[model samples]
Target chain A: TVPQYLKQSHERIFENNRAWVATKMKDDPAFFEKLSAGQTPEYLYIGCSDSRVPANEIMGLEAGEVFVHRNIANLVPNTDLNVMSVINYAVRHLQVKHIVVCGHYHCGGVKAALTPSDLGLLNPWLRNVRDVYRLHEQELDGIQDATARYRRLVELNVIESCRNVIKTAAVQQSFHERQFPVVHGWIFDVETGLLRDLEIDFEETLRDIKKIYNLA
Target chain B: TVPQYLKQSHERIFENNRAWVATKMKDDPAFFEKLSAGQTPEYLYIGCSDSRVPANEIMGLEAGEVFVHRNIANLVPNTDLNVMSVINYAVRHLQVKHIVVCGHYHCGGVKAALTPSDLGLLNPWLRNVRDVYRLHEQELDGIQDATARYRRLVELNVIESCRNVIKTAAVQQSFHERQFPVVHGWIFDVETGLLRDLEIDFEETLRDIKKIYNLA
Candidate 1:
């Protein structure tokens, strides 16, 4: 039965794919024609790879509307070539109008950062989150309940990630020239199925970060 | 109305989000409740961040059905911590049944790899695709038509990216212990609005990669 279940699940994806094609074709015969042309998405979404927090669906953006990159905890370390490349391409080439860094409550990656266990390959990656906790230690430590502290940490991590996006040369140069692609921090409450925008002050954050990370 | 249009586009996202929440609630009042509980997705989708190919929507998988990691050209460079971390977590932690590397024809990243221009930050990143071309130069150069060559390069890039996934220790060990997460290479035909399974032979690829990249 395990073998049968796995087979079924594997085959089911293709079945669903064909069905999706059929649905789209019926609605608009030219759907694929337009899609084949190119993408000029307005938003570049940087969010967690957590399954429940689907970037496009939560933002209600269509396939051709958002460029996406998902990773564990949505970290944007300055030295990370992978994310840096994504941001550079999205901002400089795609010229997207908004950049979003979304985190979620009850995140395994965030929780793992708080864990004492030795996560081998994950240590260097999750260390970014640990660094986030270290930066906000005063506020995070003040919270009594562990759950609240964890939740607040998730929010703070999102904010820090936004700052990381702001630190980029592409973002700074683009914003200086265009005054667009405003960065936003958000938290998805998996329990409530709603997004909470931290409403990060873009101008304020940019001005503050320019003292050290200025590239514009 | 230029600034007004930008404001409208930005505000439209929140409006759409609220509408989506209402629709999901009316359909399944306990949807978020179930989502909050946890995610045990059967698939881990590694795909291009090209906006036209929405991985979840195309696969007809809902919010929690697939875990996704997307980037330029759907690359899986062994050194790229972002994608490597995703593969490690999906295989060792989530234990996904299948891992799909989905690339598309006419990919901008793949095209950029062919360009001789000096892409500043993207040089190191897109070099993976260029290396793919170098590996297949004999076969690719044999093709006369430039368009066909580009398309073939895109397909080969997907296959090579799949190999990179297979080369990982996580996939190798997991497949050794559990014959699961059969690494698959797929191409989304933007022209036809359908998925083409490259039908990569998992066992054969695993056997070949193990000679050099053995971790099992």
Candidate 2:
């Protein structure tokens, strides 16, 4: 017979949500009301689908604080309409000022890209992340430790994704029309439970990555 | 002159994040540590870019309970690699049990499609939502009141998006491999702060939306 708790874990989420509403109402009555009026997030957070790295909790923001989208490795491929639509609306409509591409160490998506095994339908998605490995081959290939190499790939994926974000039609238009919505490359180190910036030099990044994907 | 408050609004967000982490650590010293261990979420939530309806907060879920991707009107057109990648990983790797496509009453994206104003680059993204309007034009056009029509469009968008989610390769394979990840179309009523299901009938939906978009 199937265990009862398995069925209950799914239902318990709703029970918790209701309890949360009650808890919020007692402390901050206007929380949902203010949120109901509308959202005007100043940031767009693109990050991994890992459960631990919540966009709001990690950033210390509220429900309506940031426009968020997460995938396997927090990627921003120019061709993906999903992130593109988020960029198009958050930049042009909501007028968000910053876009963050965040990745974490020991990312499964990055690990899959490093593996030679065929993942069937996931091959296409992992192939995109593997392209980051292709882009940083000279540096990543030389790392001695397997764990060190895995960590570098995770960091490299976020850096490349930030470049891809800048190359989008949405972010590019924001660049020329208005000097807002800067893209930031961030890595979340699960080892330290810390969030750090790659501190990419925009001048050098523009020249370095523009060898192919620069929009401007 | 640009408003200094808008510039400061962003700096304040980071401050709020610090407070949240403190709040969590106070309650559970292992909050960050446990989160860092790994995530195994059972749901993938697709919703609108509107800030108010954050997937985690609304569902009363913690950091890693749900995988989320949001965009204008929660559109899930087949061509979007962004959502496709999320689907591929969440299903193939994470093996989430449910996928929620949710929209709200009086959505700005749906309203924008009804407007004559030039949205420029947003036109392409908004146009995807408009196509859903075309699919149900006869029914939607029959509605006498504009407000009622607008509300109906919001529901229609979620239904169509749920169909789009089912059409993905990741979902189809998951179904054949092991029947799972039921997709639900839901509506968030801002006026009442209540989330209700449109209660889409999957059998009928399969016959209808699959006529055009279904892969299997």
Candidate 3:
């Protein structure tokens, strides 16, 4: 038989959803009306599938303010149609002004990628994180502390995912034409509950990426 | 030149993130400490990348309670590596107790799929939604109201996504072995901010799916 906690947890979502609707309605009687009309989000957030990182809550954004796409390790593999579609739709259709890729410390996917074990179907997916390590091997190998290396790998993965986003045609074309949708790389420090910007120079990165990936 | 609001909005995430950290710290000094320790989420949510559908907020769950994967229309095409990897990791690794496919009304992606226009890269991706319409064409075409038809299509898409989830080897194996991670199909009514459970019958659906997708 299923445990009691499982049943309650499953039922709790509906209760919570109802309470949330009531709260939103109380705050703004026309909240859903505006929400139903349309979404013109300024930000597009790509982050890990990790449970600890709730995308909108951390950034203090409300519903309809940010478009979001979360996946294992927050990867943006060149050929992964799932994430590519999100980026294309968000940049081209929504004309979002900012695209944020947020990775968090203590990510299970990243930790597993660090492990050399066979992760079944996750092997191909986690390989993207491993490839990030390959790109930064000189620096990553230089770290003596394993924990620090794990932390650094997480950050590097975020930076690389940001680069992958820039490699896309939609982002490049939109920025060249409209000078908007600047890509930002952020890490959610799970321990301190704060976001640390990697401060990626979009123009510099775009310039470097264009040497090979110049999709525009 | 970038608009003033764009620049400010770009910088505002940092400010908001910092404030969120303060609020969490004030409420519970050990919040991050606990968060960093690990995540054992009971729920895995697959929902649309639509900004209006904030997964955690609508479900009334906190960080570390639900693992998330959001993309255009909350699709889980059998061949899409992006979402398939998320499912494998969430079920086989995280052992989440419930899996939810949540779609919302007035979804931009869904609306575009209904349109006959050529959507470039999105053609293949949105074709999945069109396929959903094809499956229930008789029931759908019989509906007189256009808006209601759109709504029904949205719900049908969510149910189909859930079937795709059940079609996976990881979900099938874990579910048969452990009776946990029950699959659910839900719709987030953007207007009222309420979650409507389609109450997908798991056992019946699984029995039918196993005839063709019996990975277990």
Candidate 4:
């Protein structure tokens, strides 16, 4: 059951967003054109579907500069059709040079994934998170503190999602051939207005395609 | 130096984002609380040091939920001291439920990573990405289409970063104890306001924590 206040809030926020965008458009006429021009985005963003987490504003980038996709908890699954499609299109069409997975503090989707609930429509969506827990049961169980365990789970989720992005056929094929795209993981903090990088690097296999590809 | 038109466009988008958040707040006073409190967050997010990608506004979340840190292109390396601190806090203190590595479209850091120009202090940061290019030379070289290769590289970068997150001590220790925290990779679609989850699950352990946790 959706809360009434939440619903009202959603409407209000949507209205305000529309008005804001309209005003910006009025102020800057070329906004749409810059974005509409065949996108030469250098990166692909994977983020949460939360309304507050808008990629363009956060990165201070204009349109057509980035290729993006969003999902619950900002997850990256290797087998997901939606994600795969975005990767294929962005890499094949947009020729983006980077891919980023941005997650933020107070992420409801992640919270929901942590706490078991009957999301009904969203259950399947969050199932991936459940798998994360399943895979790391040893560490979770060892942590006596439930809260701390939950937090660790969140980080694990991000790490796993990052790996999943590379496992895709498109990505692997590109890596083997010497393409130069790198993956990244990030967290956004609401309280401090800061974005943090996990500072995790991929295996050497993704570092240079030239090592593997002869270019013949 | 930033391009003039790009600067103008960025300003408009920022304004739009601010308005959107304000409107949403108007309808639901408790919206922030609902977005921020109660549930245990598992992961601490480390992302780009960009101002536009604020954690709360983009994810529509409030404070006290996700632990956050950000740097250029949401880069994550096991050797980073700053990132290690945040991971320690999230895993040891806040006990969040999950960690997310999120990146957005048009990440300047990623573009900088790909560029040949010396970026001063940033060169080291971007160097990590260069390593990704070095590792996967075969697949990238085989692709005849320049555009296709570039896009594929972006996805590859994201996937590799996801794997990088797992190499952290926090993740390994957590995995050893119990599989609570999971890593994930994701991309945010700035235009459509949608998120695509890249399905990459990382848990080889045999135990399933979902049942043990009694979450289901």
Candidate 5:
């Protein structure tokens, strides 16, 4: 409970939580039991934590339906230990059939890189996003409207982040050992609620960066 | 499509996707549409990348339910940029009401520390987790059997990581500014499909680290 919403605390949340759980148990007694048995989700989702783009709902999946990892602008750079471990676990352990890197139309991370500011602790993380911005600047810079360039950067970040997932050692090892798991780049249209497929040809997409990403 | 499992790729996944959409639309016709518009998840969940520990299902939450970030062992070291951004965004912008660090009984990451081996690339990433083991080495060393040790380390990881979350400048400042948003440590008992609260009292928990984490 809260003395006030703006002041101290909120208690009604606990009341709602109790109802949420009891309703689930009443619907299916074994729901939690079966979920506890083990998870073997075939899809590993990497998307932005932009509050708007929720991976499960957008993919029309339920709990344990997809293994997910989210960060700002949904940027996935191989250097990040956090990103690396998630990819390694998803590829080598879960053996997900698909790895989706989804970006959205009005991402704050993309805007931050474009605006240029001192984000304190966020500077390093956003710099990684900035690198993606730089990687596709030639195309992004050519766009007339600033908004258009910002939107394009959002798409480019997803494509590159998807590429970064493939560049991992675990994924490389998985591809060397098996063929089921593949990377897909998607952009979610916030206004229309429609998701766009970049239709990234995995084999052709990385031809330009082959020398760098080819760790095998 | 080239390497068919059973039905055509479109027939299998696409069909399932459509059905899944229908189910959600039935519940709330504009479920995806309005959900696409925005999210106001008050909790930031940082858990393990283990396939078996699905946070949403465990918490009885649906899509857009909780803003989440996960990696090997759910370790949150201040050094990692990935960890920083998630905390910063959740506190500074989303103003999430709570943040949770969940660990499981049979975590492979925790086991890795018990069995020392050359993990090569995983060494650096796991090293952050290893640091957790080091922090509570005295308590861990006292536990004789590998079985008992493994279990406690799981609990220790959650408590320590929860502390790490509280240690964040963003979080400390958030608490300084407000009080509702607090860090909680939890453990999921794999054997029983039930979640156990580690019952970490923040103000008491931080007494040991008060000198270092001193923030107004």
Candidate 6:
């Protein structure tokens, strides 16, 4: 029987990982070097700084396949410098077709952000997650279980982060220039090893924002 | 400019993600479901409990693709409840083709394990990481920088975890029955969104482990 903590962890993993696993690459090692030279990636992964979660292993893509940037809680704030540079590079140079902001269950950063910790500089960085909680105070506050609430907030944060990604100038420009360039919200399950896509499309929810770019 | 905290977070994400982003996926969503339904995952992903570092998104896989078990710092013990179940399911029923124990840099679990903490039940669970450090004391102690030492220990932990996976009876039985299911080590780089396969195959590392299983 699965222990309580293990069960919870696995459930979160299953819920987060709703996507498919790819086949392992059997190509020669040299193939990767050649691919990395140009790196015309189709996707831009804005993920978390958590050690356990890596975008490439979970997705199973090879080198030059994805343009990736990671931060605490897989956040994509409008003001984040590293995230913007990655976005700029992927959109302007690599011309990535998709941008994904993936968050996972049992995130320490999210947990830390939820609690009062003396992380010094980390407090400001985690403020984004706190802000997400503040935005959805009603839903989060309603949940009695603190852990469950935290988990829910983590999911919601990913949704908001994806929304934030769409608000970026680079993303907006890419959306206009390309027929695709979709943005996605994903939650990674720690236990069962799954990814749950929240299905928030930039073109759908942010139609008004898209209008700012003169997009039809 | 990257904020100090953001920069630190970014570097941590990159160090954690180096191994994970290297192992990108090739299959799409449909393929993952089809394979997952059959329970035909070829690998076992033993990773950390950090919510942001999920197996699916980092690998770009969908549900049912990977048979995974995660905890703090992606640990795998010879006798653990959660990791055992995952091994049993993947090796016996799922007949996974490979078993991958992936670790990332800046793992909070590793850090926590290194320190003395009374997080209730988590202490015993984290003891595994502490033991790994002890086992590799000579190598780990050689490093000067604390962060660098932690990163190296994280990598070493992955290698040790891979060995632990090979030590499992389930994996042994699977090898004997099918002569399949290889084990590998990996690290996920959060900064660049790439997976670095450690290329440490179990059969090669522990030839004695191969003797336990009868090849078909």
Task: Estimate, for each residue in B67-133, the C-alpha lDDT of model 3 and write its tens digit.
Answer: 8888898899988988888898888888989999988887578997878988788899999999999
DockQ of each: 0.58, 0.42, 0.68, 0.03, 0.38, 0.04
Write candidate 6's Cα lDDT for B1-216 as tens digits. Answer: 112442343334344343333332233333333433333444467665433334655555543455555455677766553355456545754576667777666334677677665654355666777888899999888899988998888898999888888877676666656665677787866443356767675666556655665433
DockQ, computed on Cα atoms, for candidate 4 = 0.03
lDDT score for candidate 2 against the true structure:
0.73
Q: Per-residue alpha-carbon lDDT of model 4 for B63-140, expressed as tens digits?
A: 334455545566666555434444554554455445667665544456666779764434566687778777887888
RMSD of each: 2.3, 3.8, 2.2, 16.6, 3.6, 16.0
Per-residue alpha-carbon lDDT of candidate 5 for residues A1-216, written as tens digits (9 for 90 to 100): 222452222233333445655776788677666756556677888877654534555665544657777777788876787888778767766778788888877545677666667767778888877887788878877899978877777888888888887767676667556755777888776655566778766656545456776755
Please tell me what DockQ candidate 2 reaches: 0.42
lDDT of 3 by residue, A81-134 (tens): 899999999888899889999887765788888788887777898899999999
Best lDDT among the predictions, by candidate number: 3
In the predicted model 3, the residue pairs found to clash are: B97-B181
* Steric clash pairs (candidate 1): none
- Cα lDDT tens digits, model 4, A3-52, are 34433543443454455456646886664455333446666777664434
Backbone clashes (count) for model 6: 71
CAPRI band for model 4: incorrect
Q: Over the stretch B51-95, how does candidate 5's per-residue lDDT look in tens digits? A: 354455556565465787777788897778897888887888778
Residue A107 of model 5 has an lDDT of 43
Q: Give the TM-score of each candidate.
A: 0.94, 0.86, 0.94, 0.46, 0.84, 0.45
- DockQ versus reference, model 6: 0.04
Between prediction 1 and prediction 2, the one with superior TM-score is 1
lDDT of 2 by residue, B1-216 (tens): 223553465456556656766676687777677777676788888877664656776677765777877777788877766677677778888898888888887556787777777876667777888899999999998999988888888899899888888777677667656666667787876655556768776546655655765665
Per-residue C-alpha lDDT of model 1 across residues B1-216, encoded as one tens digit per residue: 024565677678778888989998999888888888776877889888775756778888766778889889989998888888888888888899889998887557888777898889999999999999999999998999988999888888889999999888888888788877788899888888788889887889888988867774
Question: Which model, 1 or 4, shows the larger DockQ?
Answer: 1
Query: Model 1: runs farther than 4 Å from truth?
Result: A1-7, B1-8
Stretches of candidate 4 exceeding 4 Å from the true structure: A1-22, A117-121, A204-216, B1-216
